Amino acid sequence: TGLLDGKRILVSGIITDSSIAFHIARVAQEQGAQLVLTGFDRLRLIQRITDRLPAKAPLLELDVQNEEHLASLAGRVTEAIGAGNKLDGVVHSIGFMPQTGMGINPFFDAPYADVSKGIHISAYSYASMAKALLPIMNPGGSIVGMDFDPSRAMPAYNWMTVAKSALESVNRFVAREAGKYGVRSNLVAAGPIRTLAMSAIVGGALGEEAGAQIQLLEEGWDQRAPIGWNMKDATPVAKTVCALLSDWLPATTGDIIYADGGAHTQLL
Amino acid sequence: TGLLDGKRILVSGIITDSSIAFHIARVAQEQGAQLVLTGFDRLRLIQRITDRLPAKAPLLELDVQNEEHLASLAGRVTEAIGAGNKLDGVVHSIGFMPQTGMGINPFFDAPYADVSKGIHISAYSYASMAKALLPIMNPGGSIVGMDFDPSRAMPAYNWMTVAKSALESVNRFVAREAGKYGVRSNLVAAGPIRQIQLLEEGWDQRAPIGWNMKDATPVAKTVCALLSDWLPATTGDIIYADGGAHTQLL
Amino acid sequence: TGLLDGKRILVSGIITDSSIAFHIARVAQEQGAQLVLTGFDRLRLIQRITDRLPAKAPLLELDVQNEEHLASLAGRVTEAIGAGNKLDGVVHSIGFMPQTGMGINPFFDAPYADVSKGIHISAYSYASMAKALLPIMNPGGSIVGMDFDPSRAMPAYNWMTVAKSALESVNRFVAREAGKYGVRSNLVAAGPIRTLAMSAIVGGALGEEAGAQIQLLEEGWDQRAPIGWNMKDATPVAKTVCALLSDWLPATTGDIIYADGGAHTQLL
Amino acid sequence: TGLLDGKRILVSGIITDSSIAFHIARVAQEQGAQLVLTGFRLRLIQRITDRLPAKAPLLELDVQNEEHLASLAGRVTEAIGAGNKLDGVVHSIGFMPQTGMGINPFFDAPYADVSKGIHISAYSYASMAKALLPIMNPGGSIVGMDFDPSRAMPAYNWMTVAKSALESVNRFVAREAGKYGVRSNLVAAGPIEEGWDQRAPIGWNMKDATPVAKTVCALLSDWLPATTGDIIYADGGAHTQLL
Ligand SMILES: NC(=O)c1ccc[n+]([C@@H]2O[C@H](COP(=O)([O-])OP(=O)(O)OC[C@H]3O[C@@H](n4cnc5c(N)ncnc54)[C@H](O)[C@@H]3O)[C@@H](O)[C@H]2O)c1
Ligand SMILES: NC(=O)c1ccc[n+]([C@@H]2O[C@H](COP(=O)([O-])OP(=O)(O)OC[C@H]3O[C@@H](n4cnc5c(N)ncnc54)[C@H](O)[C@@H]3O)[C@@H](O)[C@H]2O)c1
Ligand SMILES: NC(=O)c1ccc[n+]([C@@H]2O[C@H](COP(=O)([O-])OP(=O)(O)OC[C@H]3O[C@@H](n4cnc5c(N)ncnc54)[C@H](O)[C@@H]3O)[C@@H](O)[C@H]2O)c1
Ligand SMILES: NC(=O)c1ccc[n+]([C@@H]2O[C@H](COP(=O)([O-])OP(=O)(O)OC[C@H]3O[C@@H](n4cnc5c(N)ncnc54)[C@H](O)[C@@H]3O)[C@@H](O)[C@H]2O)c1
Ligand SMILES: Cc1cc(C)n(Cc2ccc(C(=O)NCc3ccc(F)cc3Cl)cc2)n1
Ligand SMILES: Cc1cc(C)n(Cc2ccc(C(=O)NCc3ccc(F)cc3Cl)cc2)n1
Structure with a gap:
């Protein structure tokens, strides 16, 4: 009996097979879930990646900065899952911040237009996606977003950390709205995972020193984690997401796991 | 299948068929878990209650204020579960505070001897059980304790709230000890179950999905979730x- | 002596004599501080208001969305306080959110252009002002911003709460930058105060319900506060800001008071 | 003028001239406050309190001694004169046996040792508030000493548990103190381990206790008039900051 058996779940944010969304989708399908996928910009590329998943799923284009994509989303999803059918789960695994606002560029040197784009994509779109999809969600349903603990300032992450603080606040308000549908809203705050932008930094995209900086960060995470942390394994966080998508966290909403x-x- | 299929779990704190520990244990068994139970004094009464559970399970005597009970516990658990087998889960559903430190009695009028007993039973005992039971726990295992959010002061709960603050701190350190065993330690912070009425009713008002103080199932499932393999990267934390x-503020 | 005696302090955000910035400035002047004020848009109106202060102070135009104002700010401040002199204090009491993102308008119905404007003015501008003024701040100096506790979601405040969550995160990053200058950065999280927009809402500008929600919020604050809370008295909040501007919290930075x-x- | 000018303040926990309570007392006196001191070996402490800029009565107070607490208010009043009240109370007392703090493992702390540590470090904040609030002026301030227990750290062990308890205790004392118009707050100081200086945007000197002593004096002043049940x-x- 699959954890997510017979549930219909939207998963956004797949770009490579290292993407946390790829692993969320993989575990979900392993637990019997039937998926609808959305992708940004490179849909042909994305489709080839989604071919590696254990099961087939419709792939829809969704640019969260495009109002017309959002307006048509529920209609396009319903055609994909069949009329008379609704979503039980929604996964928001979308996040972006330009190099000016995340990496080595000084905090004061991020122009607002770049930050605002990061906040649009990483924080506001969580409400946008909930607004668009809630009218087609079943009661008892679950919306999950991805978080990175912003309670303390940290080097490099800069304005993405600020965007995550905003996202945390947005999640609380989305929970208020989603409650009217009998739907939960939560974030999973993951540790660092080697996804595309992180692999690039390690590769020297932001210089030699920065690629060493991230590796020390990842190693200090593992020391601090009483049960350790593997930055090349997204599976543990994908399971946490599936747990929130399940019926086993039925009284948790507006919250961060x-x-x-x-x-x-842990402090040290 | 079952969420907890083939798992062996210690559950403490069953006293009525209304106890949260009772429902955690009931749901655990419904989800394929194989249980060991603990009781404090009236084991015959408790046995008659644990008989109302869906399945039979060994009941061991445990006074957490008794050092000899703690010393023999792992051994008594192992003899009860059969040699060569270990626990996958431990549920700490024990909490106590004399009326002097919790209720209508003023905060300042609680003598320390009563506060100390409450903290012994409600907070220190979480470390006691973890110490005793970690050597016989499987990797991937989970220890869960029950919490009530003490981040803000509230009327009546008083020194028990102080006791929960201590427990949260205790839980972080047990997480430190348990990690080498590959074991998670977390608390589930539940809403009120079963001036204070106004406090408790504000929960349903505040809750976006509402709150039913007479339904123990939602928190019981959450405990079973932490007992499962589905929260594998969470430890020292509060769910x-x-x-x-x-x-929500309002 | 006077708490802020002989200190030169920038104070932004005065619009009426009910503005928190008005009271911050009054208390600062009462404590021997020598002030430079900044105001937005309606400077003749503001000047008439700032004349009601106990002492004279130069008033400069500052629109935090205007890049030319920010680029010229330090120079205009220096010209006002005299070359060879620097600021010991900066008070950021600027905050705005369009009706769409704050009040009675549903959370989902706030367009991003309005949210982004609110976040620009209320959160991003905190970094902008620090960037502009740090090069003319003395070691031992203090920057203070105004906060409204966003850790939990609340009715009406909506996207302004999101902006404050971002602001809290911004403050942590600003403290890092200000540290190189020997300058502290902190926020004061005030309870509700009857300023211009609050008087408008309470007065029925957005209907009877919106004003009642706010009064209900204000009354639950007053009950919850062990020492009470008066929404018409800004002086206690002004004293707290002045405390942070002084040398009496010398080891507190990146923080919220x-x-x-x-x-x-307290929970009720 | 003076920050605490004309204010009367109880200061507890002075044992050496390196103890934080000592520096709190000095700055308070430098700012015009009139102090009452308490001690737990009273003869040695008196030798330490002589090094302050000014004299102050020193009274015996064992917070585990119920009789001392019962007589505490009476003894303070005779030292400051009838008709006069305390404007401030500083709780700078904290203790934990080696079994519950240091190199001894977390699981090996017997409860009798932990319970003693929690008594002195957490419960006694309420005890002292209970005993002294009836002789405190409105606008008054109780300040206790904290060390941030929100995260587990090596060595500190059960004293951290004790500090978590103190933080919860401080909130309830604030409810009680509100009736008197008195604030109750904690100061969470840095260590007075080396990575602290690194994390702090303005640095941290573990050999300089004055910055935190000044912070205590601020809460004792009228300049944080709307802060209670809180941690500074x-x-x-x-x-x-992370890293
Ligand atoms: N990698 C980490 O260390 C880590 C840690 C914590 C949280 N997260 C969060 O997890 C989520 C996924 O991140 P990731 O690490 O897998 O990186 P990723 O690059 O694999 O995923 C980010 C996704 O956002 C998409 N995106 C960007 N702009 C978009 C737009 N306008 N419309 C729709 N989609 C858009 C990208 O196409 C990409 O698929 C993000 O929210 C990220 O902040 C990542
Ligand atoms: N009461 C609430 O609204 C609330 C809410 C959430 C969580 N909790 C927590 O959950 C736990 C159980 O809650 P409950 O509602 O089932 O209360 P309960 O009274 O039914 O359970 C408390 C248990 O502690 C046991 N106990 C007391 N002293 C003991 C000792 N010396 N040795 C062994 N066992 C001892 C009792 O046998 C009892 O079964 C408690 O820790 C409580 O703090 C309570
Ligand atoms: N009033 C409250 O209940 C409350 C509570 C806590 C914190 N705060 C915060 O305190 C600060 C002041 O609030 P207030 O209640 O005194 O409101 P206020 O209206 O008196 O002050 C807000 C000021 O921001 C200025 N402003 C708007 N856009 C600007 C821009 N483009 N550039 C420069 N200035 C601009 C306005 O001119 C106004 O003077 C704000 O940050 C607010 O969020 C308010
Ligand atoms: N030392 C640090 O780095 C640090 C940091 C932050 C906070 N604090 C806290 O500040 C307080 C004082 O710190 P310190 O460094 O001066 O420690 P300290 O050892 O110098 O002082 C602790 C005090 O507790 C007193 N005490 C013990 N038992 C007592 C009892 N039965 N009755 C009355 N007094 C008793 C001792 O006399 C002593 O004066 C402690 O509570 C500590 O937890 C310490
Ligand atoms: C937190 C967190 C960590 C990551 C990888 N995300 C999502 C994310 C995804 C992509 C980007 C991104 O491409 N940023 C620009 C960029 C590109 C290459 C590079 F080496 C560095 C950066 Cl910042 C930034 C963030 N969020
Ligand atoms: C919190 C908090 C409280 C206040 C007054 N602020 C600053 C602020 C200042 C002005 C405004 C503002 O005018 N918003 C638009 C508006 C105008 C009139 C009205 F009745 C309501 C709103 Cl939201 C909104 C916020 N922040």
Whole structure:
């Protein structure tokens, strides 16, 4: 009996097979879920990646900065799952911040137009996606977003950390709205995972020193985590997401669950 | 299948068929878990109650204020579960505070001897049980304790709230000890179950999905979730089963 | 002596004599501080208001969305306080959110252009002002911003709460930058105060319900606060800001001080 | 003028001239406050309190001694004169046996040792508030000493558990103190380990106790008039930063 058996779930944010969304989708399908996928910009590329999943799923284009994509979303999803059918789950695994606002560029040197784009994509779109999809969600349903613990300032992450603080606040308000549908809203705050932008930094995209900086960060996470942290394994966080998509966290909403090996509960 | 299929879990704190521990144990068994139970004094009464559970399970005597009970516990658990087998889960559903430190009695009029007993039973005992039971726990295992959000003061709960603050701190350190065993330690912060009436009713109002103080199932499932393999990267943490009330001001 | 004696302090955000910035400036001047004020848009109106202060102070135009104003700010401040002199204090009491994102308008019905404007003015501008003024701040100096506790979601405040969550995160990053200058950065999280927009809402500008929600919020604050809370008295919040501007909190930075009567530490 | 000018303040926890309570007392006196001191070996402490800029009565107070607490208010009043009240109370007492703090493992702390530590470090904040609030002026302030327990850390162990308890205790004392118009707050100081200076945007000097002593004096002043049940951080901002 699959954890997510017979549930219909939207998963956004797949760009590579290292994407956390790829692993969320993989585990969900392994647990019997039937998926609808959305992708940004490179849909042909994305489709080839989604071919590696254990099961087939419709792939829809969704640019969360495009108002016309959002307006048509529920209609396009309903055609994909069949009329008379609704979503039980929604996964928001979308996040972006330009190099000016995340990396090595000084905090003061991020122009607002770049930050505002990061906040649009990483924080506001969580409400946009909930607004668009709630009218086609079943009661008892679950919306999950991806978080990165912003309670303390940290080097490099800069304005993406600020965007995550905003996202945390947005999640609380989305929960108010989603409650009217009998739907939960939560974030999973993950530890660092080697996704595309992180692999690039390690590769020297932002210079030699920065690629060393991230590796030390990842190693200090593992020390701090009482049960350790593997930055090349997205599966543990994908399971936490599926747990929130299940009926086993039925009284948790507007909340943040930490899938970081316990590192945030430890000072050293 | 079952969420907890083939798992062996210690559950403490069953006293009535209304106890949260009772429902955690009931749901655990419904989800394929194989249980060991603990009781404090009236084991015959408790046995008659644990008989109302869906399945039979060994009941061991445990006074957490008794050092000899703690010393023999792992051994008594192992003999009860059969040699060569270990626990996958431990549920700490024990909490106590004399009326002097909780209720209508003023905060300042609680003598320390009463506060100390409450903290012994409600907070220190979480470390006691973890110490005793970790050597016989499987990797991937989970220890869960029950919490009530003490981040803000509230009328009546008083020194028990102080006791929960201590327990949250205790839980972080047990997480430190348990990690080498590959074991998670977390608390589930539940909403009120079963001036104070106004406090408790504010929960349903605050909760985006509402809160039913007479339904223990939602928090019982959440405990079973932490007992499962589905929260594998969470430890030293607090999971809120309160309808989302603690995330809303009004 | 006077608490802020001989200190040169920038104070932004005065629009009426009910503005928190008005009271911050009054208390600062009462404590021997020598002020430079900044105002937005309606400077002749503002000047008439700032004349009611106990002492004279230069008034400069500053629109935090205007890049030319920010680029010229330090120079205009220096010209006002005299070359060879620097600021010891900066008070950021600027905050705005369009009706679409704050009040009675549903959470989902706020267009991003309005949200982005609110976040620009209320959160991003905190970094902008620090960037502009840090090069003319003395070691031992202090920057203070105004906060409204966003840790939990609340009715009406909506997207302004999101903007404050971002602001809290911004403050942590600004403290890092200000540290190189030997300057502290902190926020004061005030309880509700009857300023211009609040008087409008309470007065029925957005209907009877919106004003009642706010009064209900204000009354629950007053009950929750162990020492009470008066929404018409800004002086306690002004004293707290002046305390942070002084040398008496010398080891506090990147932090939040709550001037809310203690309401946030109590559950009813 | 003076920050605490004309204010009367109880200061507890002085044992050496390196103890934080000592520096709190000095700055308070430098700012015009008139002090009452308490001690737990009273003869040695008196030798320490002589090094302050000014004299202050020293009274015996064992917070585990119920009789001392019962007589505490009476003894303070005779030292400051009838008709006069305390404007401030400083709780700078904290203790934990080696079994519950240091190199001894977390699981090996017997409860009798932990319970003693929690008594002195957490419960006694309420005890002292209970005993002294009836002789406190409105606008008054109770300040206790904290060390941020929100995250587990090596060595500190059960004293951290004790500090978590103190933080919860402080909130309830604030409810009680509100009836008197008195504020209750904690100062979470940095250590007075080396990574602290690194995390703090303004740095941290573990050999300089004055910045935190000044922070205590601020809460004792009328300049934080709307803060209660709260924690003020004097750690150079280190708790707000990751790495
Ligand atoms: N990688 C980490 O260390 C880590 C840690 C914590 C949280 N997260 C969060 O997890 C989520 C996924 O991140 P990831 O690490 O897998 O990186 P990723 O690059 O694999 O995923 C980010 C996704 O956002 C999409 N996107 C960007 N702009 C978009 C737009 N306008 N419309 C629709 N989609 C858009 C990209 O196409 C991409 O698929 C993000 O929210 C991220 O902040 C990542
Ligand atoms: N009461 C609430 O509204 C609330 C809400 C959420 C969580 N909790 C927590 O959940 C736990 C159980 O809650 P409950 O509602 O089932 O209360 P309960 O009274 O039914 O359970 C408390 C248990 O503690 C046991 N106990 C007391 N002293 C003991 C000792 N010396 N040795 C062994 N066992 C001892 C009792 O046998 C009892 O079964 C408690 O820790 C409580 O703090 C309570
Ligand atoms: N009033 C409350 O209940 C409350 C509570 C806590 C914190 N605060 C915060 O305190 C600060 C002041 O609030 P207030 O209640 O005194 O409101 P206010 O209206 O008196 O002050 C807000 C000021 O921001 C200015 N402003 C708007 N856009 C600007 C821009 N483009 N550039 C420069 N200035 C601009 C306005 O001119 C106005 O003077 C704000 O940050 C607010 O969010 C308010
Ligand atoms: N030392 C630090 O780095 C640090 C940091 C932050 C906060 N604090 C806290 O500040 C307080 C004082 O710190 P310190 O460094 O001066 O420690 P300290 O050892 O110098 O002082 C602790 C005090 O507790 C007193 N005490 C113990 N038992 C007592 C009892 N039965 N009755 C009355 N007094 C008793 C001792 O006399 C002593 O004066 C402690 O509570 C500590 O937890 C310490
Ligand atoms: C937190 C967190 C961590 C990551 C990888 N995300 C999502 C994310 C996804 C992409 C980007 C991104 O491409 N940023 C621009 C960029 C490109 C290459 C590079 F080496 C560095 C950066 Cl910042 C930034 C963030 N969020
Ligand atoms: C919190 C908090 C409280 C206040 C007054 N602020 C600053 C602020 C200042 C002005 C405005 C503002 O005018 N918003 C638009 C508006 C105008 C009139 C009205 F009745 C309501 C709103 Cl939201 C909104 C916020 N922040």
